[PDB]
Amino acid sequence: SPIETVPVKLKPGMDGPKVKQWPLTEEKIKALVEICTEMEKEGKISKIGPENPYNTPVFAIKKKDSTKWRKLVDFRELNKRTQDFQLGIPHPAGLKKKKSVTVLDVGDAYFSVPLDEDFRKYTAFTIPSINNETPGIRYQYNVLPQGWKGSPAIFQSSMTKILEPFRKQNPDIVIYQYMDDLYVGSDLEIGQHRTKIEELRQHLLRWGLTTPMGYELHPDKWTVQPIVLPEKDSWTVNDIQKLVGKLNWASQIYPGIKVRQLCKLLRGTKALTEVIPLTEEAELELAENREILKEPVHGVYYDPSKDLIAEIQKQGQGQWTYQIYQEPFKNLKTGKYARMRGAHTNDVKQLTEAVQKITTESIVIWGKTPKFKLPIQKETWETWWTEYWQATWIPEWEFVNTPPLVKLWYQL
Amino acid sequence: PISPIETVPVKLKPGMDGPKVKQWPLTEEKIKALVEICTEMEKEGKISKIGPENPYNTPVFAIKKKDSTKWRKLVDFRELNKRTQDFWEVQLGIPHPAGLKKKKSVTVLDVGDAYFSVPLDEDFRKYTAFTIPSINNETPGIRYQYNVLPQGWKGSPAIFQSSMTKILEPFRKQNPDIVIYQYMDDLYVGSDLEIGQHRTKIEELRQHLLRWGLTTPDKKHQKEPPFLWMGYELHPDKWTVQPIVLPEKDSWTVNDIQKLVGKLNWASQIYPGIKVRQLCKLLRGTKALTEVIPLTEEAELELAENREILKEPVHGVYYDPSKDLIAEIQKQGQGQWTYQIYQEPFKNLKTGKYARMRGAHTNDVKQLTEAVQKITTESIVIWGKTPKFKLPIQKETWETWWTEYWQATWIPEWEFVNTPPLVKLWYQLEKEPIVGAETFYVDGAANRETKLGKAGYVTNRGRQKVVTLTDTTNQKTELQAIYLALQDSGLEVNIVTDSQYALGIIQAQPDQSESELVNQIIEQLIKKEKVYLAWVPAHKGIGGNEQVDKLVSAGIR
Ligand SMILES: CCc1nn(CCO)c(CC)c1Oc1cc(C#N)cc(C#N)c1
């Protein structure tokens, strides 16, 4: 049901994405063929020729409380070459303060709005075949595609119309749209909250988009976990040394930190196991530092012109620590992630969970996804991330070798 | 013929216009050939004469193939190609035999005069203009233009490919249970039908193709197994590598060893056990291609071991979609791994080898994991599924390593297989300081300008020592200092360094390194009974570190 399409434009000089398709399992290929041949019948996508030199990777996932294959297009390249995405969506600062936030998939809405004819070419993707027997099945989009930051930017106008009545009826509720999702926050009792969400789904329903008791976030109960300083009766050289190092490091973040009194204890070539009584002076410095570490961090502020970075460390025992900053040590936020009953044997599974959680928090706090520094081998991550991935979006990531000390500094 | 298929709209790169490369004056004989060649092509609709309007031109040439006095027409599309849009990419990979499904009957059909049976976008033909020059730049030459996909043009391979895909589609829909593989101008067909129906299905296919402008060979003209396909020898129920001949030679050149490694790496697809590591080593520094390289004792042994393997012709079996894939891995030696994939015990669909990471400090557990990863990727590519692994590592060894390592890691479903040499960790660092063990506070320094350096330690038992090093770095001194402490310590030791660098390396329990030094340290770490390693920040009022920093820094700024 076409309308007046919004003319889209790539950044001057920038050209369309030409990203290779990674091999997929027969299971996922079968699923994508079934899904795509159905989208073709509905006119959402159409086959393309070899004169289209563009490509964007495609995968198949399954959301939580979902056993039906879903198509996930990785538009990260196209997104970076777009913006345009010009008329962006403003991020409300009230969202992070709500007692509860509910995430709602509204991606099905985008398939109503036709995509600018001259932009379609850039949304090209391939369904590969096993053992390269058949050439890939190539398609492009005719409608706003899910996963492209251009879709929500264009759909704003229609989204505000859809939400106008609900907004005027509940002017205290915060609604934030990021990619294929809607973030809805209120300070209401969980019962009213859920009731209000249900009502919101009905409004969306009237507009053809079935928006299914989604994941419930509580940004209020989010508290930056400190760096953690031990609490022992007697201390060894090893423990003080371990403490000096830790604080020496933290001093790079929180200026108020002191270590001269503690260091005074570490003098002479003593055995690591020797017990050492702490001077009353060191006791203060220590306690004083613990207080500093409780509170945020004076000086760090979110800069909307700069990228967000997230580092994750494997702590063991299904535990993972992470930090979000724009400039190293200048932590805007730190946290933890403990394996939920089930992933009792999978590192990749837990890391993908941790990444999604951290990404979700970023969207809520800043309305932006961070660039991840993943403690894993590329090929391994490349091979398995889709096996447990359930988000409609995909953040940027790179692979790194965790510095052994960093693990300790943030170890709990 | 010329397929009645809708054309692919083609265009030049954004800010560009057609080629306008002048015709070189050509020989009388070469001009005669072009005239007749072009007359034939023109009669078949492949090309058409054009007016003087068309301002485009691409050079034309003529060359005769030996053992025959028959001329051939060569068009230099280098210019038009630079101006032609980018296209897709024919294919992301080539079918691997091991992935070929078992089918009772298989046929190869090649599409004849492929490129020339496919139409070119009319609005683009104007850019394919070429000129047969007149004997000595007389007057205008005979100007032509293509109507079909020109041989050597940028978009031909891709446009042909698509045209074939569009043509094969309806036939695919009406025959879901038949496999067709598109490869360049070839076309392989497989079914599980008894000849009778199969030849019928083939014939129906050809008729569908012919109905679309594409000629194929008829029964008596079709190739017969063995098929010599892209380096492989295909039989209906088995495959292998094209006959490999290892040249018996006295004195080897870089070029000879290069080709040797090539054939060997190639043969490794089905012949298990091939080792190439010792030959590659000879290819280091090379500097030349005709320079002869004397074979090391190790390379001669390796080459001999390879000959033995290749003496006995080996074959691969085909894929059965109903059975599980099983991959087995074995350690061949220093950073050398081989694997084999089968469905029925020891009937290999495929073989392979792994020997990455240039000794960036690693251990057998990391390597095995890497090999598993590589195998997993290729299995997905070749069969669309991951195999079940058979590894020469204890579940206990595996869990111990993974749980404690800093990087997330994960092997798909695997089973231990007692196939020596087994993978294991050779040593392990203590989790807490050793009571009643001497504590060495080590340190190293190196002058940036002079490259001179000092390494040493000081203990809690009051010992001390400082070595001078030449042509060193800060990194090397820190590792030298730890090495010193390990040499003068004995069975139990606590070592405190200021180097995150060294702590990092040792913590990963390496058993192999490109660094002679790191190997010394490893060799030494294996001998110990207990080793605890701790870190402290340098340049602090930290007893021990503060002191070694003195003797090691004195005389070296
Ligand atoms: C369905 C095509 C096919 N399947 N099989 C397994 C038989 O049980 C074989 C071995 C003969 C085939 O033939 C090819 C011949 C040539 C040639 N020439 C190339 C390829 C490929 N890929 C395949």
From Swiss-Prot, chain B:
Mutagenesis / variant outcome for changing residue 68 to Y: Confers multi-NRTI resistance
Motif (Tryptophan repeat motif): 398-414
Subcellular location per the Swiss-Prot or TrEMBL entry: Virion
Recorded consequence of changing residue 69 to G: Confers resistance to didanosine, zalcitabine and zidovudine
Effect of residue 333 to E: Confers resistance to abacavir, lamivudine and zidovudine
Outcome following mutation: residue 157 to S: Confers resistance to lamivudine
Effect after changing residue 106 to I: Confers resistance to HBY 097
Outcome of substituting residue 188 to C: Confers resistance to nevirapine
Known outcome of mutating residue 225 to H: Confers resistance to efavirenz, emivirine, HBY 097 and quinoxaline
Domain RNase H type-1 positions: 434-557
Site positions for Cleavage: 440-441
Effect caused by changing residue 75 to T: Confers resistance to d4C, didanosine, stavudine and zalcitabine
Region (RT 'primer grip'): 227-235
Residues making up the signal peptide according to the UniProt record: none
Effect of residue 189 to I: Confers resistance to HBY 097
Boundaries of every Reverse transcriptase domain copy: 44-234
Entry text on domains: RT is structured in five subdomains: finger, palm, thumb, connection and RNase H. Within the palm subdomain, the 'primer grip' region is thought to be involved in the positioning of the primer terminus for accommodating the incoming nucleotide. The RNase H domain stabilizes the association of RT with primer-template.
Summary of the function given for this chain in its UniProt record: Multifunctional enzyme that converts the viral RNA genome into dsDNA in the cytoplasm, shortly after virus entry into the cell. This enzyme displays a DNA polymerase activity that can copy either DNA or RNA templates, and a ribonuclease H (RNase H) activity that cleaves the RNA strand of RNA-DNA heteroduplexes in a partially processive 3' to 5' endonucleasic mode. Conversion of viral genomic RNA into dsDNA requires many steps. A tRNA(3)-Lys binds to the primer-binding site (PBS) situated at the 5'-end of the viral RNA.
Protein name: Reverse transcriptase/ribonuclease H
Species in which this protein is naturally found: Human immunodeficiency virus type 1 group M subtype B (isolate HXB2) (HIV-1)
Name of the coding gene: gag-pol
